[PDB]
Symmetry: C3
Subunit: 106 residues, 3 copies
C-alpha cells in the first residue's frame, strides 16, 4: 500500500490498542502495525517525492520506520507477557512517533 | 559469504528445526538463520546485478529481508517460551518466505 | 549525532552494563544503545564520504548496525526477564561486534 494508507492503518490500530480488553487484541493490533510499518518502509512519502530513493532524506525516512518497528516491538513484548496495561502505556509513545512522522512527511 | 550460500544456510537450519525436540535446539537454529539473513541483506542478488545500487528494486530487496527477520523473531519468541511445536509450525512457514525470496531474486 | 559520537554512546553504555547492579540499569543502558545504533544508520564514516549513500560499502555499514541491533535485542529481552547475568554476558559479546565495526570503518 501507499504511505498515506499505511499511516491510516497505524492510527486505526493505535485506537484499537487504546480501547483494547485483552492481550490477544493488543498483539493482533501491533502485528498489523508492524506489517504496515514494514510496507511503508518501501514507500515514498509525499514530502519526499522530489527526492531519489537512495537520497540521504529517503535513507533517514526508512530509518525512522526502523525506529518505529523497534517501539512496536517493545509494546509487543509487553503484550506477549500478558501485560496489557503496560503495552497500552507503551503504545502511548507509539502515538507520538506516528504523529511526528505524519507531520514530518505528509 | 555468497547470497546463494546464505540461502543454503537458511535451508540447512530450517531442516535442523523441523527435526528438533527441545526449545534450545530451535533457538540455536533460528539464531543462525538470523545471522545468515543479515549477511544476505547486504548482498546484490543475481537477478539485480544489472541494476544501480540506488535502484528501488534493491531497496525492496533489503526490506524483504527485514520482513523475514521479523518472522524469524516471532519463531524465536515462541521457542524462548518453550512452545517448541508452535515454533516448528512457524518455521514451516519460514520455509515458504525463505525459499520465495530465494526464487524471486536468483 | 555523527558516527564517532554514536559509537562512543555504545561504548559508554557497554561499560554501564558491565558494572551494573540491577535489571533497571541494564535495560536503560541497552535502550540507549539501541537508539545510538539506529541513529548511526543515518551517519556516514569519514572514509565513505565520497561513496554513494546506497553503495555496497554504505549498505554494509548500515546492515552492520542491523546486526548490532538484533544482538542488543537479545540482551534487552534477557534484561526484561530479570536475567541480568545473561544480559551482561551478551553485552560482553556486543563489545566484540562494536569494536569490529569500529575497526572496519574508521
Ligand atoms: Cu523480541
Amino acid at each position: 500500500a501507499d504511505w498515506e494508507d499505511n499511516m491510516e492503518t497505524l492510527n486505526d490500530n493505535l485506537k484499537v490498542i487504546e480501547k483494547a480488553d485483552n492481550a490477544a487484541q493488543v498483539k493482533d493490533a501491533l502485528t498489523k502495525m508492524r506489517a504496515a510499518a514494514l510496507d511503508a518502509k518501501k514507500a515514498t512519502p509525499p514530502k519526499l517525492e522530489d527526492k531519489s530513493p537512495a537520497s540521504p532524506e529517503m535513507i533517514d525516512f526508512r530509518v525512522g520506520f526502523d525506529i518505529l518497528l523497534w517501539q512496536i516491538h517493545d509494546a509487543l513484548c509487553l503484550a506477549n507477557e500478558g501485560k496489557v496495561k503496560e503495552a497500552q502505556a507503551a503504545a502511548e509513545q507509539l502515538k507520538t512517533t506516528v504523529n511526528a512522522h505524519w507531520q514530518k512527511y505528509r
